[model samples]
Target: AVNGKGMNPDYKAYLMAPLKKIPEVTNWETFENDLRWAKQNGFYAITVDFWWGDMEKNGDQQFDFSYAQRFAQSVKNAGMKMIPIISTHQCGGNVGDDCNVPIPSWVWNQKSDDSLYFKSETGTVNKETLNPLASDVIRKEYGELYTAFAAAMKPYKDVIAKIYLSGGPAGALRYPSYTTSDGTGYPSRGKFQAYTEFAKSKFRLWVLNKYGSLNEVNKAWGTKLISELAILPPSDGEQFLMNGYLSMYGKDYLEWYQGILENHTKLIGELAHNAFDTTFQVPIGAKIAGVHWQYNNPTIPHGAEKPAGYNDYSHLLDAFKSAKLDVTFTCLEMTDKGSYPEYSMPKTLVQNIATLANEKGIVLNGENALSIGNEEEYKRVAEMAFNYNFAGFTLLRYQDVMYNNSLMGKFKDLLGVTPVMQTIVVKNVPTTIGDTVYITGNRAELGSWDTKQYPIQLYYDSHSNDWRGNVVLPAERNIEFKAFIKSKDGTVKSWQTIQQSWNPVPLKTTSHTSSW
Candidate 1:
């Protein structure tokens, strides 16, 4: 007896598959079954972990999009959309004790510069992550590598709603922190990143630009703060040891380190936008690791644990906003009831992320909830995503639901509803010189009142004499709108004669094209 959780039938929910979990030769039927279930239960999209290392491991940037293309075809076969989570840094082995995963060996063997990998205090470079500060590294990974993948994806861009760029651990801007203490209870976290001389030189230059002179910098640091003495504390300062410089430099230390994190995050966005925006022509987004309220503090915490402003939500949000990515998401894994501890609940983090996402005009989205203790846990997270107005939610996996039939039943019952949101195109929007046409309407997604906000600028299609573009708007509702042309300069406007109304747009329709 499946207890169906009630939900809006039109709600947009998605499934996330693991890195290599897409079924093999024998399990094709099983995979199809999973897709069928998703469609049958009302999922409109599927998020796949498109592993980076495995794709182009053979080197020379010689890659294969055939797998991804076939996967996209499979998704379309199931009547769903595709959202590719591009994994840059390797997973599996990077996490605690999961050593099977490895970064592309060529990434290490074929670096243009010797300083492309993350350096630790012990003079050993981290094989886990590429040095974000390395220009060569960024060029190879973010620039060329990304463009190659995007190029392969060009044909299937129609099904790709957005490109979710993975930053570091679990697709956020971060470094791998291996847990020590014999992997016992509350294993102490390790610290690793950016200690390379290349990074150090950049940091010194950054400090010099900000403070101007060493004397002024000394005044701030209370010591003769010279470029020779690295501005950052010891390499183990975070997650390993709390250095004296923390109290000596105070908020400056936190802000400066956070500045580094923020800068890297923004850099990731810039790289993503540059690579994908023109070729992919879709919204680019990044997911962030959720740092709980206990972790975000004005004062640095004791020991090797996370200190204040470490992966701080405010800092991260501002960084992504500066990068100007189309969408951003945070893991709701903390929302798990029984798996994690009770004190560090996900309530605070979820609220702050949702609130800030709305304020920043970022498409708020969330994921990671399966195999937790109870059905109520999944329901609560589902409701949280909906209540917070997330564009949608992606489950941690597809297999979990398959094995746990109860979850599939509950998911169908709870998230099987959504509004008639579909792409609408104006086949022939009248356009003239010195003016452009836009679709403005009452819906928030439609720019509400000010056409400037979320403006659906129509691109001219000369063949059909139509201004063509896609706008997601609800169907079966009387949508009041007027398509008019506005001048490039200050103010010049001409009406389309009368305001038009899409009264009671048809349900079950995926798209609409209007000419008048």
Candidate 2:
């Protein structure tokens, strides 16, 4: 959500989503204005949308990057990093459709339930279009789509730090959550059906490969009993694969209900293996494969219920671990009017995701980042991510932040020292008309394994008493941020703000955590 109208990433905070489909900031000036405003307000990261429909016309016939290019350059000139979400494929189409899926139409298709092999749960594909999964031509098309798109995006590669392929609204990040269960010609109902079909088809293909013919597999299926499905004999790697696939699809139906946690996990694997697609990374790309927040947690806050967040299948995080896509960015948009769960997991998730990312490559050395949200959640998560050495917190758009004015103090105040502990801002001498002051505070220790992220928030707050934020030095033991008001105007009065982090000192700080 936007704290101010355009602040993002804490400093210059403008996170604005053009409410109208044809954004007001369509041209370069306004776009630059937003970014410039963000820089002035104090932000380093700029988030933008890379819509597939907007770029491609008639699927394969055309590609447009004109506006995107202008926007990217303006963002770079404004001195902010770009995090673009590339959303393609329209999910639902024609009547009763919700076509925000993001991919071009050529790649989206419908196939019969019978053709799906074993996909009865998810329902059937659309009657129009073609199924990329069903036909080799389309499957290659899916890969080619990424390849071509990535190639197109190559020029702006450096500007884009991260790109989430399915970057549209709602559940457009990954596969279809449902298959229009009501058969309204809309594709938004049968939750796990798509995943189930995909898995089942894969397993069947595996079985076919292992055997001499599809006929033999048909015989095995014909003889098989319902109970026998779960347990295939050992050395029957072929059978084992099939049953495992069924477990993922059929049996777990009730468990996932409308959504699947395994979807996230599986997607991560798909993304990791998405190398066949040229756009996997930039320049053929390194920053293009992250998951879009739209698909995360069923694109709804708190998800369907407690466990699922909104739907089910928060498994992508784990999949991130397996796929080595640890820099999983959670871009929670506050712009939408939905009542997203107020506490969308704490910033502590930063610790979890980053910890996993670190384990895979394990390189979280600063700014354990969490998106900017509620003060409480931010406080909670910042502490966790910071302590864990996660990277920077990513706030969507910047517009929301500057408008609030709360960002100045809060961002400065929420400095974390550990996953559970924060560095108390004992005092921050506001740089007022006659005051150049220092921010002094104890860097609370969360046992060990914690470090500072950025230089303390510092800058000239154009809005107020030189309240511009900045960072502090790492130091040997005492953590402190020294500031020279340098100079100030008006009869400004400065307030000295102090902050600190407190963590439970675990029974004696010497407890061993690793044991049998």
Candidate 3:
């Protein structure tokens, strides 16, 4: 929720009051302590830019969630909420520009130098700067952080737990690509996560099967067939980062980086509350605990008669029915991960969506607050996003909303009764047990952000009563379904109930599953 792209709508809010002007300020201290002061002033939540690049800057051994802990504590004391954008890479140092945090330079350095990094469609670097696999030191460091991060913020688990984990932004970023982080944005001799082991051997075999000869042995990375080639990078061949066999951008270099990404997502599952998107590819209910159903915003459900192929967001919720995630946060927007519209939803669409969720099994953080920069827009959007029927919201700011007045005033007006942005709940006796569900829906065209649309989940719980078993819908009207049940010791021993479309019957089945 940085700035809206496309329209990059104006939230138009700037908190002009002097930091010193707030009264009763003497009692609180430190940046984290400011939450109480800001809460009194107007804001209800803050967005924390916690990056893997910085925390693991020097390696995982020396960890730092110190600021994160303080920030979480501040939110608790002030009775506020938070949005911790979990970044996989960093934007500082030769990441081109827009110096930001996601992965750290140390990790990016693992790919060699910035010049060789692959470029994503958004013009962001395509190659993954950090190495999740082969880099034993890094993997351990990342895991340690999650153990501590989760344990430390247990008090605010409800709020602190709602994390927004972004997969790589463009190309096969979250997955693997034709070229990725290894060296000089090219291929290197030593480490090749997916490329080195699996793909390479498989590539040679495929060539023999096709051309069959020593002559064929002399070949290039692409053209040959591969069962699993990871995701495609935004760029291709000589024009792209395919520098050489020893370079990060070398031809077929993406294969290796794709492996690196696979490892990274698996690692994230081990550490995060859950990843709503597919890139965080950990086994369901294993290291990766859950999935989030994501989208821009729910449009007015034109009664299923959307303007000839327009994206009717309600379908997105139905699409992700297969994702048996504990919590569901619907980020309402036009394209997924695109930009926040300083506005949202058809009046009826928002309410109906909320009511639908409340009755459904998914635990939804219905929608979010846009940039607090534009007061009028914020006011208009908030009305649609935060309704009595929905769970709550995670206000976006610290850099934007908190400081903006018009945005802050509306926030202050809703604080006590309305949620800041994030909402939390818990479960034990599994509900919706042994039921196969679908994760469907999709955006028809490009120029959008909601690209996370594969590898869905389907589950059934014997008992569930809160926002602990559902997710957001998708572009398609339905998703395929399957359900697996586990034994006490931990084993997927059997499959149970299943559904295709997430509609009247599917929802009823969800209710039945919610109860033992």
Candidate 4:
């Protein structure tokens, strides 16, 4: 007999297949086989990145969703749910990006300078994602894109469990403050991206509106400013790292910078909800990168994250809550390396964000920052999920977990064995308030037919004159049990003469009714 130590069915794991190209799935036979194995192994859903570049490649609003339709239909055929990310950002620039999918050529042809993209302090423009300050363009383009997607995916409404809106580079809701062009790497404080004239003007306007005049602004920030136009973000990144962030001016600048990112997230989330709320009716989700490194830098706390606009996570969670969005955080497989060069504290960061999300009554999900090939990493991921009570977990790519048997075994253990909720109801029980009903069964979860150990207690209903209890049991196994009445004074009143047997279906509830 199998025991019931597996995870609850409500917790699900989704696999994101590595899609190298668009217009068609490259290898149909192998992809189909992988889908079959995923379904057989109790995986819940497949996360698909519906690339905007691929769909509207020809021109603005010239949408082609044939590939997406076929892809979703395949997942549906595999008897699994779907999580489609409306990937508005480019693909190849981010880490673990094995494919090249740029944001449509036409969108790029519309802008020639750094105004339409994120400009670093060094004058390098990150073309991977559009500038969040480009509100009018993003509203028109992203709104139309989401509306088209909702209309196209109407046929698969039942299978689409959740819709994730891509907010910036790597599909995370943050600024492209840390990119390859910025000369910044892991553990280094990335430069700010407020160099564009449009962004600078917005910052100046925000300052003027808050302080009423340049005189008041200078008085509060302790800076000698001649005009409102002179107000700007840090001119030199290194100097700011040394002492600027400690000043009142830096505080105000950082607040405004992060505020823009938060508002951008809210805008995108609201657009997605408007498009899908009536049709899909699933929870909309957003991703935030776990910039866990350089979190404890003495010079600047969370230096890397400050550039990425994550100073205060409570405010970000508030924005998500206001937009009615669920949050998916990454890096669950990493531990805190609290020693030498890199003071990375991924575990601590996860805990902080998880606590905030829980406190705010928002649904939280987890994902691995990178691919894991060992059991130890898998265990860490499982521990995080269990500890935080994550609503769902997503593996980075499909190929890593499918080909390796050992890794697959570990993942299966992480997912836990198939278990079903078994409800046993006994009616016409001659029980007073002091008497109780207990279930003893053939499995360990049901006390292994030992009446003394692991007693499964059932509650009695006075209106229906019945006793009922639910037990978690391993599915697809023959289980035998008997209901007996016990007195408050440790006396066995009566037992069912015949044994009740059941074979539970995986992931489904099994109900049994009997009389003594």
Candidate 5:
């Protein structure tokens, strides 16, 4: 019985610690107490960011694992596992970042090559993360960093649940096409990031190799080009979308653009697997950002996804499968706001990704894009988790969950450790073969006293000779509800006379018997 509630021990909840202040626990006692509380509340693990900037801050190969060791020891003492993310990307540039933690300064000190970072068409280089095209540099530097991490963490191998690899900005497997530093905010198709000489050179080689000549490339692109050097990224992202996305050139170019990201994902997955597989026999995971908005745009469908190097997620999922990695996706708490100007469809996006992951037989995990305290939002997250059977659900941060009792309770309820869920059994109901029983109540989970929106149907149990169902409700609330029978044609046949009420107790089930 996991969490003392007979819940599935494998399906667990993970608490994501604050990224900006990880491995910097100023107060050990307080931190220990928090871990204890988290363990007592049935948290399986704590996800932490082992920042590249923080560990190897001074120079290359100058690794520091002292703080991380202490933190892991404390978590182990509290009887919780650890999911350490190799946060190769920088902090503070993305949303919800309060402090700055850039990549190693020495990486930028190599000023001889301007290709170390992704350059935009406007001559602006996004310093948020390193360029995926910098293959040689990334292999050597990231290989060394991950090797050192594996060695240092060998002592706590038993406590390690999974190792996460950061592919690009914000620790997701994508490009920093839209960032706060750049003015390309939401709804707008962001600029391409392949204007750097190295990226362009790679693109030129890709085209030349594919077509075998500059003339063929020009003919394919429907352009008059003299030199192979002219083969470049989209001059204007939107214009390229409008004119040539469906063309041969657009298809080839977008493939190469996102192909770099796919190869980078495979490379990092291999590096992480090789580094930690010898010591820790645990699954390695990678995150993909939930670029949910701008999906329904007429001019450029999946416009935001294109700049972020995610035109086709099946390609990336194939890469993850090849590398034997688990996929962790965010934006579980968000719903479709397609009516808005941005045409956001986060819920739909999550469902799409989950469907793909399921098809590919990949283990899918979940995370909320932003810190949320709303109970309804948590319900949405729970629905997504149960709907798709996510391996685990990770809340955004620990501080928010720790400070708010409601949030903590919501999380506990999500883990099935609390008595928030009530198993309702109905017997002696006069129902025909084509009829079904459904519970209706004032709460939204109970169909808001209206059976049309959400039916909340119950199934007949042959063993018990009755109908039973489960509904999650807030503990200690006076839930007013009644039973109703509906036929196959969707007409209510009969309703109970009295409106039954139950002031649910924590850590127990509420069973009520009713007759029609």
Candidate 6:
């Protein structure tokens, strides 16, 4: 003890290593060796890429789970945790071209009118991709796929940490952001997918949900006329590269796309939750794409988009929360667009995501994509994630670690599990007759002054005439916090006049005795 004061308690930080493409990797001995090595070298969990095509290759409503089952069993055998990613978007393919096969051809063949796949604004089909707003039949069939998946893993729930239900291709959330050698860089105008009749139908439904009626939707879009049969996303045809929206309809079109994206993600998450609700009960969530600028911008998103307009960060995240997912996975790697940790960089992106995740009451985890930088870069990203209280992050591939000993060696400290801080004690808090006490702070760990961030609240003790509770705060940082009282209904909040400070590093157990 320092000066007769007890030291802060240290806890183990959450950690997840990645084991991708077990379908292809198990063929090589190196992959298995890498798995054992990562586990022995401080990684506690594995995110196994369970390819949809590998599991359902045949034409019947059947599944061939030989590879996936072995992989799941193998991770358990190796004594590491598992988070299986059920890839629904496409396998062996990307946005640029149909490099890999799409979802099982059987899924498409079973459809009567091709309503399950996505189409562009000009009516051309997007190859190897299913529309997120697939028909009710298609959705039902997908439920079967999830049921089978849940059944396959039920026996091994002991080792399964959670399930990551993949959304778009590469399992990142969003439609095929068609990459190309033509490389105009941003998605081509009017070439983006998912404007089919089914999407239009869903758009009308979303409008009804959002605005109460089509007349209200018309006013929101600044349109003069719209009906069920006639409603459609704006024909503005503005692609990612367009500077800004030209008309109100263009803005509405972007919004409608975002709503579809949100709806689709939430539906998929709900499917996952229902599949394993109590059967193999594990936390399930959708993997979100990283920071992006998804309006009329030309740049490809290497990160999650900010939450100002359409399909940005907030829109997509809200869907996951609405679906009641246990956690939100925001995968990020170094981007070509900007530098790291600066004003508009990846560091800021992670902070924003942490804030959003807190507001949603969902655990936030991160992953590093293979497309990004080298070992040192990954270390920096890991450190940043830890600073922002990310549950954990998964590396790209096990094989990368197998061959790169130098990189792996550098990652030990950062990748090594650390403890989550849980030691802010607020006692004797003043309270209103029918209100709750809370603390908002200038520190990000305390929600950066957003009153809704962490809800650092107090518990009342009528017998003792005091209030108290534990608050999780980052260690070794000077922080300022303001106390406020909110109504039990959360409709009213009033801040206390004088704020409090931790001086320099507050004690591991910082205690506060508040005054009215």
- Lowest summed lDDT window (length 10), candidate 6: 1-10
Q: Please, what is the whole-model Cα lDDT of each candidate in the order they appear?
A: 0.59, 0.37, 0.36, 0.79, 0.79, 0.58
TM for candidate 2 is 0.50
Per-residue accuracy of model 1 over 257-290 as CA lDDT, tens digit each: 5676677778777888888889777777777654
Best by lDDT: 4
* lDDT per residue (tens digit) for residues 130-194 in model 3: 43343354445445655555555565665542454433431012322222342322111112223
Report the number of backbone clashes for model 4.
0
* Candidates, ranked, lDDT: 4, 5, 1, 6, 2, 3
Judged by TM-score, which candidate is best?
A: 5
- What is the Cα-based lDDT of residue 273 in candidate 1? 85
- For 67-129, candidate 2 gives per-residue lDDT tens digits of 677666777676666765554434344222323434455433334343322222324443232
Model 5's TM-score against the true structure: 0.82
TM-scores for candidates 1 onward, in order: 0.69, 0.50, 0.42, 0.80, 0.82, 0.69
* Backbone clashes (count) for model 3: 78
- For candidate 3, what is the lDDT? 0.36
List runs of model 2 lying over 4 Å from the truth.
1-22, 25-27, 40-42, 89-102, 109-139, 150-158, 167-190, 195-201, 205-326, 329-354, 362-373, 412-516
Q: Could you list the CA RMSD of all candidates, in the order they appear?
A: 11.7, 14.5, 16.9, 7.6, 5.0, 8.8
Worst 10 residues of 3 by lDDT: 1-10
Q: Which ten residues in a row have the lowest lDDT in candidate 5?
A: 1-10
How far off is residue 456 in model 5, in Å?
11
